[PDB]
Every structure is written in C-alpha cells, then in structure tokens.
Design a protein around this ligand. Structure first.
Ligand SMILES: CC(C)=CCC/C(C)=C\CC/C(C)=C\CC/C(C)=C/CSP(=O)(O)OP(=O)(O)O
Ligand SMILES: CC(C)=CCC/C(C)=C\CC/C(C)=C\CC/C(C)=C/CSP(=O)(O)OP(=O)(O)O
Ligand SMILES: C=C(C)CCSP(=O)(O)OP(=O)(O)O
Ligand SMILES: C=C(C)CCSP(=O)(O)OP(=O)(O)O
Ligand SMILES: [Mg+2]
Ligand SMILES: [Mg+2]
Lengths: 200, 321, 321, 200
C-alpha cells in the first residue's frame, strides 16, 4: 500500500503540471454508467495529487445515485491506498457530483439573489462585475476546472458548468467503461503539455 | 466564388441530412502561421481576414446563413501595443471597406452585428462599427456576428446587470429571472444558439467564447491553423455535426423538457403556499389552483415582455452613432 | 322460459348497442296491486316474488348477468306485525326452496348475496341466508344481490365504521381514507355500480337504496306496479339507458378523471410541505419530489391492500352459520 | 311590488305542502347555463316560501361563477319583489352553490375527520351511527332536500348529494333555458301531491 501510494504520487509530481480541479463528463447514455470505473478514476485523481474532482452526467444519474457512488469510491480508496469518518469527510470535500442544474440554473439563481438585493436598495446594478458574480455562483472558494475528461460519443459538454470552463482543457476519451490507469495518465500528460497563453 | 465539382457534389450529399443553421468560429493560429511562412505577424492576421471572407462564401454556398466569429478578445488587449494597434488598424480597414461596399451589402441582405464590451475600443472604431450595424439592420438574408472586444463572462455579467436594471426600474420582479430571460439579454439575443463551435490550431479550450450559447453545441477542435482553413476542414466539421445530431438534439430536448417540468413544479408549489396560508384547499372543483397558476404565469409574461421592449429601446439608442 | 318472437327480435336489435351489465330494482307497489285485484296483501307480495323470478329470466335472456333488488328496508320494520311476519315467512319459504333447488343453482352458476344489517332479522332467517350465501359463493355465471333489512345510510355508516376499525387496529392511516376505499367497504363491494336503477309504481324517489352506488346511474321511474312488470317495461328501461349512455359515460369518466387530478394535486402538495420544512428544494435534478411521491402512493396502497385482506377475512368468518 | 310579493306568498301557501329545501340540478352541458334563468328559479323559490335552494351542476360551472350567479339573483330579487347588505346576507343563507365534491368527497372528508378521532383515542368505531355521521357531514343544521328539479336530458342525479337525497322527490323538466313561473309552479304542485309513507 505504501508502495502503490508512493508510485501514484511520484507519477503526479513527474508531470510538468497537474490539474487542481478535474471534471469527469460522461455522455454515454446507451447503458447505466459503471460506478466501479468512475470510482477508479476518482481515486486515481486523488492519489496523483488532484484536489477536486467533479463527476457529471447530463441525465443526473450520478446525482440520483450519490450514495452508491461514494460507497464505491470509499471501497476502492481502500484496497488501493490501503478513521472511516475522516476518509468520508475527505472525499466529500474533494468530490462534487454535478448535474445540469449546477450550470445554467445556478447562474440564474445567483442572478435572482443579486437582483433581490437591488430590490432592497442594498446593491446597485453596476455593483455586479465579472468577479462579483463569480463570488456568489454557489461554487465559491473552489477553483475552476483545469481539465475535463469527456467520455463517450457526444462531442459536447452537455451543460457542464458553462461559466467555469472558460479556459478548461477538454480531452476526449471514447469510453470510461474499462478505463485503465495508463489511459487516464495519458490524458494527464496531454494536459501537462498544453500551453495556455491567456490572450497574450 | 462558386464551388468546385467535388465540393459541390459532396455538399449535395450531406445536404440530404441535417444541416447546421448557425456555425461559430474561434479563428486561432494566425501568428504561428506567420512564423511558419516567415512573414510579419500583421500579414498573418490579414491572411486571417481573407480566410474569413472565403469561409463565409463557403457557408453561403452551403445554406448556412448565420455565422459568429471571435475577432478580438478583451484578453487580447494584453498584447503589445504594436500588435494591438495592428489589429485595430485592420478593423479600421475592413469596417471602412464595409462602407463603400454598401448596396452590395443590401443586394445580398447581409446583416452585420458586432458584439462585445465595445466601449473599450477606440472612440473612432466605435463610430465605424455603429455605422456598419445601423446600415445593415433590417437586412435578413444572412447574418454575421463579429465578437469584438468580447468575452463570455463579460457578456453574461452584462445580461444579469440588465435584469437588475429592470428590477431597479420596476419592470421586473426578481422571481421573473429565468434561464430564458438571461438568454434574451445576451449580446447574441437575435440569433439561435450555434449548432457547431469550431476552434482551429491545436487548442482544445473555449477561451471565454459563447460559454452559455454553446453548452449543447457540437464542439469541433481542428489542428489546422486558421489562415490555412479549407472547404474540407469546414466539411469535416459539418460531418461531425451530422454524426452527433440525433443524440445531441435528444439531449437538447430532454434538457428543455426537464427545465419546463421543474418550472411548473416550482410555480405550483408557489400557488400551494399562497393557498395554504389562506384557508383555501389544495384542490377543489372551483379549480382555483388552476386559475392562480395561469395568472402567475400571465402576469410574469407581461412584465417580461414589457422589460424586453424597454431593453431593446435603450439598446437601439445609438446615436453612438 | 324463452323469449317470444317479438321479444327476441327486439332483444337482438338493442343488443347491437351498449347493454347494461348490472341493473338494480326497487320492487314497489305490491300492496296497491293487491287492492286492485281484491286479494289479501300477502298474495300481492307473493305475486311480487313470481315477477322477480320472471324478470331475472328476462335479464338472463338479455345477457344482463348481475341484478340487485330491494327486498326489505329497515324502514319496513315499522309495518304491522301481521305484514312483517308475512314478509319474513315469504323469505323463509324462498330461501328454503333455494335449498333443495341447489345443484340447479350450481349448474347455472348462480351466486346469491344478501346485503343489509342482517343482525336485525330473526335468528333462524339469518341461518338460512348464511346457508344460501355460503353455498353459492365460487359460482360466477350470474349474480343476484338481495338487499334484505337494508338501507343505504346504514350501509355507508358501516363502511366508515370498518375504515375506523382499520385505523383502530393499525392497518389504516386516516389519510388513506378515500372515495375508492369507502367503495370497497360497502356491502356491494363485489359488484360494479349499477347501470340502471328502476323503481316501479308512481314514486319518484330512491327510498334509501344504493345512494352511493347509483350517483351516476341512469334512473328509470315507471308507473307500473311491480307484480305487473312486463318484458316491455324492462325493455323500455334499457332503451332509456342506451339513449343516456354516451353523455352519462362521459360524465362518469370526467368525474373519475377529475378525482384523480385532485388527488394528485393533494399528494404533491403533501410532498411539497414535507420538502419545504426540510431545507430541500421544490424541484431538482435529483427528482426527489418524484420518488417521495411514488413512496407516498406505494406505502398507501400496501396499507390499503392489507386492510382489505383483513376486512374480507373477518367478513368471511361465518360461521354464522 | 307589494302585489307581486303577496301573490307569490299566497301561491306557496295554497299548496298542500312546500319544500323546505329545494335542489336545482342542471345536466345540460351543450351550452353555458343561463344565469338569468337560474336566478329566476331561485327568486321564485324564495318568494313562494322555500327556505333553502341548492344550485348544482356536475361540471362545477356555477361554483366557479359564484359571483355572477349571486349578482344575477340579487338583481332579479329587485325589480321583482321591489339594505343591500341585508339582502346579500339573506341570499347567502338561503342559496348554496354545489358541485360534485359536496357529495361523495364530503362524506369521505367526514370519515377522515372521524377516523383521526379514533386514532387519538377520543372516539370508538362503534360511536359512529347513522345520525352521528349526518351530524359531521359538512351540511349540518341544514335540512335535507325535499324536492329536486332536474333540468336537461340526462336521467341521472350526476353526483348530487347522494347521502341527502334518500327520500328526495325528483321531478324532471326538459330544460331551464326559458323557464316560466307556471312551469316551475307546476312542479311544485306535483311535489305537493306526492305521498310519502316512510316504509309503513
Ligand atoms: C476587429 C478585427 C481585428 C478585425 C475585424 C475583421 C474581422 C471579422 C476579422 C479580422 C481579424 C481576423 C479574421 C482574425 C483575428 C482574430 C484573432 C485575434 C485571432 C487569434 S489568432 P493568434 O493571434 O492567437 O495567433 P496564435 O494563436 O497562433 O498565436
Ligand atoms: C326477504 C323477502 C321478503 C323475500 C325474499 C325473496 C325476494 C328476493 C323477494 C320476495 C319479496 C318481493 C319480491 C318483494 C317484496 C319487497 C317489498 C317490501 C316491496 C315493496 S312493495 P309495498 O309493500 O310498498 O306496496 P305499496 O308501495 O303499493 O304500498
Ligand atoms: C479573437 C480570438 C479568436 C481570441 C480567441 S483565440 P486566443 O489565442 O486568444 O486564446 P488563448 O490561447 O487562451 O490565448
Ligand atoms: C323493500 C323495498 C322495495 C322498500 C323500498 S319501496 P317503499 O314502499 O318502502 O318506499 P316508501 O314509499 O318511502 O315507503
Ligand atoms: Mg491563439
Ligand atoms: Mg311501496
């Protein structure tokens, strides 16, 4: 266990850059997703040093099966990697399970909250700039996703956090269904090699 | 600029299937192209314009009558003065050559829209832009949206600001804010969301372009540098769209049906609360839940349609000029 | 007892249209008939029985396989002892002649049910009745329900009492009480509501008969006295049913659709309240409103189906005997 | 006015018997009902001496148009018959507008209320007899309808107060649409001539 944990950490450190926040986007709807394969992806992310992982599907299947997914993550976070409540708390802090309502519907919700403050004479329309709106998005204190792994045949983000993916690198794999560590890590070195010029 | 035999033949074939009504382009890679051809960076961007004109003729020949292009990001203001001025001067040439070439604009029904935080551009450039937009309104045979000094977060932030203005002015209730309302406050409010988003060069990111509008669009990342774009690159992108189209439109429709379902549940919970506080029952033969529900929606629609009419009045206030 | 040529011909004609599956009879006018024929009142009632047997054969020949008859009202206990005893003795004859005539009951599949507050009848009569009912259960080719010592208010009151028993015993929640549940606790719970209610003699009232069950039935008041009933009186009543049938069944169906609509609104307001108290939202992608709604209904159905199974167990406890 | 009022009162008193409570059942659904004809029926009932009038249709049209109906009654209670708030209060006491939910749904409601008392150990199942249930029916203190005038082509009560019509005389008229006083009063003398033996 101390060997497998050390190896995955050295793997993450060997890359030119690591994502602080990764998104997992599943587009395949021809079958119920494989919880054991999603959990392996999540556990690899944590073991290589990625702080946050967002799991997403446009049908909300993962959101309606939150407990089964977390339980699968916890199980595989043992066996691999070798205080249960501490392990539970540390996965709830690192793993967000998202559905479409966390994108556009959440931006609308922030707009409602802000506009009611204007209605109460506590804010003005001009008080809302880019960074202010990001502050009340419902995803505050968490960084934007640097890397999204999109699995399946749909060439679309399918509603995944449109505000947050402004600079996200999008890497596509054909399927998550029997995903291997080597395939996952191949995507990591693709992100490590990408060059972001930020408009300059 | 007509199509060749092979291009025309292939066009006819794919036209038997679903065709995109609206395509969006991130025209990336002009500077790498200049380095590869050993030319000054200004001619990399000028070659970039010539390719835009060529690609637009291809879309027209394909029946794609609405195109949106990323021409200048607010982030691009961070480049050197030499390069920024070079791009501004290119815009000064083309937008001025768009004039003189009027009537040729009217004959073909070309509407030109320029979207972005335009107050950041040189004052003179804003005047040329306003001229081109003022002249080509009412034209409706094809539509080209030029995103100039644009980012998507700045556009989204502005849409919310306009809704907050409607509340501050009394035309809007905070409860009326909706996904659809925000849609109608974007800069792109006169066009449907793009069927395809195309980004050239090797980059697999969106760089703050049409984030809200392309949430369900078919995304195509092609390695070619933008000044080297060919008809067949465009053809390949449309091929991607057609292969994605059935699953993508079902997801696009499921999203819509799920949003309307949730809105109906929220509204009827509202009607329930107002009914419960009152002695009145949850249901009854009087069907007062059903009339409270119709009044809740109708008064909401009248407020929104009045806010939109006022928003378009102050939008069309230029005059700017 | 076969039909004549004209009766058979007319039967074939109306059988091309909708036919009632269940007819209910208030057999009124026996005593006026006796006064008109100058016979003792007991033979007016005995003639009344002979007409019941004849009319049942007519229904059978028409494919109407379920008939409900008002044979004795609790209110009829207020008549003179001479008349009450005469009726009780008539019941003692026929229910005993129903025995001996068994096997002829099995061969034709005649199920006999006797409905009412039977504990008010003489103890011996209750034994004969229980025998006839016990023997003709499991028979299913035709059904005759004899309302004996019955009123509708007494039946409705008993149904509610049984639901209150289920609550007292823990099989039932007060929220589970519904129109349909009350339906399944009536004495008539094994038969559909009657298509026609027929009352003879000149009276235009229901006299506490099947008030719940005939709320949407076609009502036929015919002047003829019951011992004088003919096939053509019955034919006329069926003719009334057929002319009412389209508007009556649409109203019967609109009522049902309106009840289910209101129940769904009540249940979803319940789910709303439980969700609102909780931090949880009115709607969401998790669709927890939709799963709370299915559990609310399913746990209700399991409690009701368990209560009904226990109610039928104590109903079929005779033994009474 | 004093003549028309006196005449209608003498008409009511001339009959062998008058209903204390009359029900008006409208089955015709081939057109919106005529409020002016229903109101004339109601005003005639009051002027001849009938204490309560229930107006009913199985679609709930009168219930959803309560104000228009009452306003029409009040208008015709002037002009005919010659303190507006007193006239309003006296019509609200005499006129009930019913729909199907006032029949079976109300009996079910009383059953729910009674069964929750059993659940609270404050009543026993045997405490509910015929008269007890009638006491908590939601139509308490009001007499049962003696006479129902059914208008239109449907030969059914269509859900009208099934518990309360146990002894109600049901008289059928083909239409309410241009109803005349003579036609209404003809139905009254039909009820006056009917003989109720109450099981004896
Ligand atoms: C407003 C204006 C300038 C022109 C108006 C006319 C118009 C619609 C377009 C003309 C300019 C055109 C076609 C493209 C320039 C847009 C641009 C900055 C592209 C990034 S290529 P990068 O520089 O990033 O090169 P690499 O990524 O390889 O480094
Ligand atoms: C239980 C029993 C008695 C018999 C069982 C057999 C059976 C099903 C029926 C036999 C008795 C039959 C057919 C009819 C009698 C029922 C009855 C009291 C009718 C009222 S006629 P009213 O007396 O009212 O005459 P008016 O109105 O003219 O005064
Ligand atoms: C005007 C444009 C097409 C800007 C979008 S392409 P750009 O090269 O600026 O995108 P970055 O690599 O993030 O710098
Ligand atoms: C056994 C029965 C058919 C009773 C219902 S008919 P009955 O003559 O008793 O009805 P009333 O005129 O109210 O007395
Ligand atoms: Mg670039
Ligand atoms: Mg009788």
């Amino acid at each position: 266990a101390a060997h497998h944990r050390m190896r995955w950490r050295a793997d993450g450190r060997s890359l030119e850059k690591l994502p602080v926040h990764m998104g997992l986007v599943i587009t395949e709807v021809e079958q119920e997703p494989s919880f054991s394969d999603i959990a392996s992806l999540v556990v690899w992310c944590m073991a290589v040093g990625i702080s946050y992982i967002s799991v997403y599907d446009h049908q909300g299947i993962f959101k309606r099966n939150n407990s089964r997914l977390m339980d699968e993550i916890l199980k595989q976070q043992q066996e691999l990697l070798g205080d249960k409540d501490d392990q539970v708390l540390n996965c709830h802090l690192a793993v967000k399970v998202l559905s479409p309502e966390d994108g556009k519907a959440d931006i609308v919700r922030a707009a409602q909250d802000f506009c009611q403050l204007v209605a109460q004479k506590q804010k003005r329309p001009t008080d809302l700039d880019v960074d202010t709106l990001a502050s009340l998005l419902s995803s505050n204190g968490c960084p934007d996703p640097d890397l999204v792994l999109k699995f399946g045949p749909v060439d679309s983000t399918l509603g995944f956090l449109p505000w947050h993916i402004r600079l996200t690198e999008i890497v596509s794999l054909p399927s998550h269904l029997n995903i291997s560590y080597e395939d996952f890590f191949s995507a990591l070195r693709q992100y490590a090699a990408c060059e972001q010029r930020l408009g300059k | 600029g007509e199509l060749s035999l092979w291009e025309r033949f292939c066009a006819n074939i794919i036209k038997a299937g679903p065709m995109p009504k609206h395509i969006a382009f991130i025209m990336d890679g002009n500077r790498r192209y200049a380095k590869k051809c050993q030319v000054e960076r200004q001619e990399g961007h000028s070659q970039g314009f010539n390719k835009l004109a060529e690609t637009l003729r291809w879309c027209l020949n394909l029946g794609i009558l609405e195109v949106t292009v990323y021409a200048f990001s607010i982030e691009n203001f961070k480049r050197s003065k030499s390069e920024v001025d070079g791009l501004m001067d290119l815009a000064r040439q083309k937008f001025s050559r768009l004039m003189e070439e009027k009537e040729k604009l009217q004959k073909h029904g070309v509407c030109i829209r320029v979207l972005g935080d335009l107050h950041l551009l040189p004052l003179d450039l804003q005047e040329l832009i306003a001229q081109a937009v003022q002249a080509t309104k009412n034209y409706n045979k094809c539509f080209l949206n030029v995103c100039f000094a644009y980012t998507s977060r700045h556009e989204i932030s502005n849409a919310v600001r306009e809704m907050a203005w409607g509340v501050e002015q009394g035309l809007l209730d905070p409860s009326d804010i909706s996904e659809s309302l925000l849609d109608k406050c974007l800069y792109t409010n006169r066009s449907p969301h793009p069927d395809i988003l195309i980004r050239t060069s090797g980059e697999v990111r969106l760089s703050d372009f049409l984030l809200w509008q392309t949430s369900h669009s078919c995304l195509v990342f092609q390695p070619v540098l933008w000044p080297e774009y060919t008809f067949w690159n465009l053809f390949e992108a449309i091929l991607q769209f057609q292969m994605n189209h059935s699953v993508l439109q079902k997801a696009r429709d499921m999203y819509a049906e799920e949003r309307k379902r949730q809105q109906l549940e929220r509204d009827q919970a509202t009607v329930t609360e107002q009914l419960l506080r009152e002695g009145l029952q949850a249901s009854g033969d009087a069907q007062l839940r059903r009339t409270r529900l119709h009044k809740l929606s109708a008064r909401r629609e009248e407020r929104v349609q009045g806010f939109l009419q006022a928003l378009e009045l102050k939008r069309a206030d230029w005059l700017a000029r």
